[PDB]
Symmetry: D2
Subunit: 258 residues, 4 copies
């Protein structure tokens, strides 16, 4: 009869919500009656996802914005407050994972990944702070990864760096946000079927599939539903923490051990 | 419209559900339409909680049983499988946290705590394996603690050991249970208002409250709602993992971090 | 021309010192001039290891003792203090890793593993508290494992629990021991070429090998040298902590 | 015989003119390791080079900014010229300015990320060929408990930068293993240093009571941990962390 208090009518931002995990998070929240502003740089991709999600209970709309731009963060929050009247949930999700061996990585390569993945998470949280404070039950959910905080994978030394940087930030942010009644937590997916992971190629997807006790790559709904849990009133006592959503992938001591 | 898939009508066991966190877990699942068998050693305590929860949607009944005894674990599962028609969720929750300095801990002190807190988790999971497998969506939630896996506290070196033992066990158990479609995860509460935590005294409670950025001890519902998430179909891809429910307690570097 | 302060003359116990990692810890400390008492249940294995190490700078001798028996812990400490005049280092190392699936493990199976691997670590620490306190620079090094604290491996759910139990114990113990100037820390070996690990077969041994970035199983000296570092005076500010010694094995997002 | 002598080997210590980097430099020098220390302030580099003039291994200085890849390349070339090669890199330079979340500007974040994380990556990249040629390369990163483990108001960007170093090295260790280079990190708790003294006596008098060991750490505690990682005997340790903090991260309640 009753599980979690309904989030209907609340207001959320998902950065990088046009594709992949961000889209699955937006759809998960929208199905729960949360109005969602999704962001991204490509307008056509935002428009297709807004069109695709037009039948959801919560209204998904788009704001074209680069997470690396602090001005775009402020505009995103202001536009979301304008459309919804306030702001309750920020899902700091936008992220990229280009691959490059450490000896090949340029300053620009490193700043590209750290700017989107880490700086872009900090910028949207900063911009959203006052509206989340006015919420009285603010929720920030960060899309980190097992890569960095837990795992290594050749080619992703800067990616993993940026995923760990998110968590180092939120362990302090959680303490600064607690008097404002905002929780901040992070989902750490393992390997989820997305357009972004598709670019890694089939042999990467097979490789990770065989390393996962659950026997499959995860789904965007898996991450959206973890985000949803963190946003509930029922999770008000959870802050500064991580949840690994990976089918057991970080557990095995070795390969065939699965 | 829709948040998670209703768990209405599923079957659960909560060990040590007559008091404290286990009762909060039982009530949380009961309010979700889950039928719950709570266990414990004191029949009066079980009867009173069953009566306290008489008005919940799901049906909360009791089974008097000692987690340290594997035969009781088998009896608990069978009674549950007869009353509910199956078994979908096992909350390995029963535990004790008496306090003793390392130089005072007897073999009995250590075995009492390891047996209740760790052996009693293993035995209930072993007893439930077959019914959980037949459910096709089996869920095990372990009540661990920040104490042991993360923190230390003088007098709890055997308690901390048992809480971390639960986690070492489940990181392998999650792999063995994956082909059976059973996930196993732990909630790691920080400090939660319970009858057991009351026996630590007012100085302990004041000390811990001031250590918590959220500014309060947690409630039993906080832990119940975390166990509820793990038990959802929507958490099928989460196994072998932990969730710390502590108001931020384990974060501060020191006491101006807080102050 | 100076790295760490010589441990020459100090007094150590290594539980389970006749074979495998314990013997490597014992030899590493003896090479550093530490007098070492090794323990084990089999007198022949103790006698043979004492004879093998009879040329080391530190004197290695043996006490036949079961780590699961608290009286044997006490007798071990008393005998070491009688032989050396004190006790500075305790290497709580003794352990077993039989395998069994979750649904096959009997109460006696579980207790055997928890008894040796966890209780035996607690009992030697307890028995040594007094003498370690009197040393003024006491050191406890626990041989834990990546299995349990970090990894899972089917058939070792009770092994993994026992190894993680060591760490939960030591995080509190480090706080109770700090006023006594005793530090307590753990080495978490990955996969180390030993007698006990050879009881897993060549299939298990080749399996972990390709899963390790360093390209090899570790050596008992790798673990002994970690323990040696924790025992230095220079590590007096390290306590309640862990060091994974595994050639990178816990790192890969997949071992392919 | 404790560990194999490192006498005659070659090391870089970034930010080695003060505090922890100076303790690392003096610890390696006392072991007979020739050490190039970097920094931006020549006056502080000259003063430290002179203070350590009696050490067995020779401490010399190269003025360089960790945030500049070209300064990283120059540091490694100058070091290979002076010593004949390079065996050990201690990526240690770091800053910890304090600022509340809502006040951190983009420049504040880039300054801390640039020094603490980018500066670690750049000196490792620059050293890769020389470290590979040594056949026993050693990278030691100075991270922190702050970020990887703890939070402290005002240090959200600093903690991010210290956790960034570890996410980097967990992958870097796998890429470096075929080159026979290990890479680990020391995570100091609270260590008596010059930069740490900028936090004031209130911050000083207050982290001491929360540490089970009962004191702040010393730069030698960090140097000796870095020395362990650099030994031949630690060849099978890579991608890993060592917390040096007197038990500070352990207490459930610091009171
Ligand atoms: N897929 C996995 O297995 C996995 C696992 C662990 C963690 N993650 C994390 O999940 C997050 C998204 O992963 P994904 O697989 O879903 O990626 P994806 O499928 O490639 O989608 C990324 C989204 O982020 C947006 N984006 C990219 N750069 C942006 C920028 N500078 N500003 C604003 N938006 C930007 C993209 O829109 P535009 O390109 O049009 O801007 C797109 O909507 C990342 O943080 C990633 O690290 C993914
Ligand atoms: N309260 C906290 O802050 C906190 C924090 C972290 C973790 N935890 C964990 O949460 C669990 C319960 O904590 P709590 O505060 O709720 O304790 P509690 O209030 O004392 O409740 C303990 C429950 O377990 C039962 N129990 C005790 N021994 C048992 C046994 N041998 N067999 C079966 N049932 C037994 C008790 O009933 P009977 O005595 O009648 O049998 C009681 O119902 C423990 O595992 C504890 O480690 C608690
Ligand atoms: N080998 C690995 O890859 C690995 C990896 C991680 C951790 N570890 C840990 O390292 C420790 C030992 O490993 P190992 O490979 O060296 O094992 P091993 O080769 O089988 O030797 C174990 C030693 O402990 C002794 N022992 C066993 N049971 C005892 C008891 N009840 N009382 C006293 N001594 C006892 C044995 O002598 P007796 O039988 O005669 O008593 C033997 O000397 C264990 O704690 C293990 O968990 C090993
Ligand atoms: N002190 C602690 O309690 C503590 C705890 C955990 C971790 N750590 C870490 O240990 C490292 C050193 O800390 P510390 O307390 O020893 O700081 P410190 O006493 O202030 O010394 C910092 C050193 O880094 C150098 N440096 C600063 N900015 C630089 C730049 N842009 N390029 C090159 N060198 C630069 C400084 O020289 P110049 O100014 O001349 O450049 C100085 O030699 C840091 O990475 C810190 O995060 C410290
Ligand atoms: Cl992290
Ligand atoms: Cl654990
Ligand atoms: Cl652990
Ligand atoms: Cl096994
Ligand atoms: Cl990290
Ligand atoms: Mg795109
Ligand atoms: Mg001698």
């Amino acid at each position: 009869s009753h599980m979690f208090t309904s989030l209907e009518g609340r207001s959320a931002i998902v950065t990088g919500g046009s594709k992949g995990i961000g889209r699955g998070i937006a759809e998960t929240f929208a199905n729960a009656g949360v109005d969602v502003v999704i962001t991204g740089r490509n307008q056509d991709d935002l428009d297709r996802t807004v069109a695709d999600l037009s039948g959801t209970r919560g209204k998904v709309t788009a704001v074209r914005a680069d997470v690396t731009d602090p001005e775009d963060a402020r505009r995103t929050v202001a536009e979301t407050v304008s459309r919804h009247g306030g702001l309750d949930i920020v899902c700091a999700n936008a992220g990229i994972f280009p691959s490059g061996r450490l000896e090949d990585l340029t300053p620009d390569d490193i700043e590209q990944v750290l700017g989107v993945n880490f700086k872009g998470t900090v910028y949207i949280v900063q911009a959203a702070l006052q509206a989340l404070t006015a919420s009285g039950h603010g929720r920030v959910v960060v899309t980190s990864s097992i890569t960095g905080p837990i795992t290594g994978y050749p080619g992703w030394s800067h990616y993993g760096a940026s995923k760990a940087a998110q968590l180092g930030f939120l362990r302090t942010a959680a303490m600064e946000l607690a008097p404002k009644k905002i929780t901040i937590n992070a989902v750490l997916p393992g390997n989820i079927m997305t357009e972004g992971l598709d670019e890694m190629g089939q042999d990467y997807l097979d490789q990770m599939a065989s390393a996962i006790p659950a026997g499959r790559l995860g789904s965007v709904a898996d991450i959206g539903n973890a985000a949803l849990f963190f946003a509930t009133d029922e999770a008000a006592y959870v802050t500064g923490q991580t949840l690994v959503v990976d089918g057991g992938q970080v557990l095995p001591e070795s390969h065939l051990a699965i």
